[PDB]
Amino acid sequence: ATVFRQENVDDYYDTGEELGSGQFAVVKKCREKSTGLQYAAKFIKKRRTKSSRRGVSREDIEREVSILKEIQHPNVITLHEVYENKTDVILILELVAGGELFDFLAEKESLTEEEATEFLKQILNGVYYLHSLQIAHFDLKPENIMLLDRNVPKPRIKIIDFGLAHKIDFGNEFKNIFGTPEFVAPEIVNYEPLGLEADMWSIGVITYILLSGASPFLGDTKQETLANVSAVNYEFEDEYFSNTSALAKDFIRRLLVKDPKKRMTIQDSLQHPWIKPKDTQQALSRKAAAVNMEKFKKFAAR
Ligand SMILES: [Cl-]
Ligand SMILES: [Cl-]
Ligand SMILES: [Cl-]
Ligand SMILES: [Cl-]
Ligand SMILES: [Cl-]
Ligand SMILES: [Mg+2]
C-alpha cells in the first residue's frame, strides 16, 4: 500500500458544509490555510477489517488514488493531496462548484443540437484523454458530469468520481458487475470482458438523454432495465425525437451497439459528422435541430 499524509487535515484546512455524500464517502468544502484556496475534501471510510462491509477496501481506495494522481486535463477533476487517519482516507480534490451539467442546461429556454454538442464535445475531450492513457472511467452518467463554474460565458465541464475507474491491463481480462443499470454497457450486465468500450456505450446513453429527456433502457424494475440493456432494446420514439437530426441519431446508434468491438471508439466519435460536420449541409441540419427542452427539463427534475 501507499503511505498517505499522516497529519490531521484540520491543521492544514478549514472545512465547512457538506457538498455531497455517498454510501462510504462524505464531501465537504474546504480552504487551504497556506494559500487561501478552496478545495473539496472527500472523506472515504476505510473497511479496516476484511470481513466488514461498512467501508471501502484499501485496494479500491488505492486504485482510485493512483488513477487520480496520473490525470491532468481541463475536463477531468484534479487531485491536490491525500491524507489518512485511523478511519478515513481523505482526498483533497479540485472544487467543482457549478453543479451537474444537466441541471444547468435545464435552466435554458432552448438548446440547439449545435449548442448541445459544444458541451458534449467537452465530455468527449475528457474521455479521449482518459482512453489515451488506457483509463476506463466505468461510471459515466449525468451526475458525474459537472461544471467548474456555472456563472461564466462558456462553462467548463469536469468529469468526476473515479471510484470505479480502472487502468486497462493488456495481459488480463477484467470482468465485474457494478455501476448504475440505466447507464452500464451489456458487457457489464453480462459479466463479459470489459475495456474502454463500456465508456462509449455510456456516452451514447448520456447523449440520448441530452437530446430527448428520455432514458433509452430504463425499465420498471432493475431487472427489466438490465434486460433492456442486454438486448439493446431502445427506440427513437417520435414523442421525444421529433426534431432530432439524422446525424444525431446515427451518432447514438453507433454507440449503442452490443458488440464492443463494433462500437464507435472515442477517436472515431470525435470525427463523426454530428460532432465534426464535413459540409455546410450537415452543419445547418445540426443547428436547425433542437433538444426536446420540455421533456429534458422533466428529466433533470426527476
Ligand atoms: Cl484553484
Ligand atoms: Cl497528490
Ligand atoms: Cl449493474
Ligand atoms: Cl439480464
Ligand atoms: Cl434504432
Ligand atoms: Mg470514492
* Burial readout 21-43 (b: 16 or more C-beta within 10 A, e: otherwise): eeebbbbbbbbeeeeeeebbbbb
Residue that has been written with the C-alpha cell 452490443 in this structure? 258
Structure's resolution in angstroms: 1.8
Distance of CA 2 to the CA centre of its chain: 27
Q: What residues pair up with 27 in beta bridges, in sequence order? A: 20, 42
The closest of 87, 73, 83, 84 to 162, measured between CA atoms, is 73
Dist. CA 65–CA 80, nearest whole Å: 11
Dist. CA 251–CA 123, nearest whole Å: 15
Residue 235 alpha carbon to ligand 4 centre in Å: 19
* Burial readout 69-87 (b: 16 or more C-beta within 10 A, e: otherwise): eebebebbbebbbbbbeee
Residue 251 alpha carbon to ligand 6 centre in Å: 31
Burial-class residue 213 by CB neighbours within 10 Å (0-12, 13-18, 19+).
buried
> What H or E segment, with its residue span, contains residue 191?
none
Dist. CA 148–CA 11, nearest whole Å: 27
Known binding-site residues equal 19-27, 42, 94-96, 100, 161
Q: Which ligand is nearest to the CA of 250?
A: 5
Method underlying the structure: X-ray
- Three cell numbers at 63? 486504485
Residues 191, 197, 202, 208: what is their CA dihedral angle, to the nearest 10 degrees?
Answer: -120
DSSP per-residue letters across 14-40 = EEEEEEEE-SSEEEEEEEETTT--EEE
Alpha helices for the chain (secondary structure H):
58-70, 101-105, 113-132, 186-189, 197-212, 222-231, 238-241, 246-255, 266-269, 280-288, 293-300
Residue 286 alpha carbon to ligand 6 centre in Å: 37
Start and end residues for every CATH 3.30.200.20 domain found in the chain: 1-97
Q: Which ligand is nearest to the CA of 26?
A: 6
Do the beta carbons of residue 41 and residue 82 sit within 8 Å? Answer: no
SS3 content of the chain, % helix, strand, coil (to 5): 40, 20, 45
Dist. CA 254–CA 251, nearest whole Å: 5
250 is catalytic: no
Which residue among 139, 149, 220, 250 is the active-site one?
139
- Find all residues with CB under 8 Å of 20, minimum gap 6, and list them: 26, 27
Residue 214 alpha carbon to ligand 4 centre in Å: 21
For 1-97, CATH number out of 3.40.50.1000, 3.60.20.30, 3.30.200.20, 3.30.930.10 equals 3.30.200.20
Task: Return the CA Rg of the chain.
Answer: 20
The CATH superfamily holding the domain 98-302 is Transferase(Phosphotransferase) domain 1 (1.10.510.10)
- Three cell numbers at 139? 461510471
Using alpha carbons only, what angle is made at residue 31 by residues 30 and 34, rounded to the nearest 5 degrees?
A: 145
Do the beta carbons of residue 256 and residue 204 sit within 8 Å? Answer: yes
Start and end residues for every CATH 1.10.510.10 domain found in the chain: 98-302
- At residue 187, what are phi and psi to the nearest 5 degrees? -70, -25
Beta strand 157-159 with 145-147: parallel, antiparallel or unpaired? antiparallel
Q: Which ligand is nearest to the CA of 81?
A: 2
Known binding-site residues for ATP equal 19-27, 42, 94-96, 100, 161
